[PDB]
Amino acid sequence: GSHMCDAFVGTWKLVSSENFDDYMKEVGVGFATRKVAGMAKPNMIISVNGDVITIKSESTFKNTEISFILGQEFDEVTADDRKVKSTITLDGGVLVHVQKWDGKSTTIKRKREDDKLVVECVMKGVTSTRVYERA
């Protein structure tokens, strides 16, 4: 066992969202993508195999999948089609995911709170909170 496996592994379904449209605007997502992305009710699937963590987002809008080792930069094409350089670390039990592109930066934190997995997406001063529960 590991902390990561116990906390995060499994299949999660989105149950609430706040300020996601505003977050997407701050990121630079265009109107049509924001509208379609904002409707989605994704499942988030998290798995671990040795040192490799995989996070999948499955929805009618887009399916995404990242696999990574903590602390080790990788390439990511986001749901809104940004080509970013990402680094994910585990800081005090919180997965902290930094994306860099075009001189910009956004941070996504994933954490367990009670029976929820809370995803906080932050761009400058704009935060979106997306809450998931086990499927």
Ligand SMILES: O=C1CN(Cc2ccc(Cl)c(Cl)c2)S(=O)(=O)N1
């Ligand atoms: O709830 C969430 C939100 N995600 C990030 C995410 C998804 C879609 C778009 Cl368009 C953008 Cl800008 C960011 S996630 O995959 O990290 N989980």
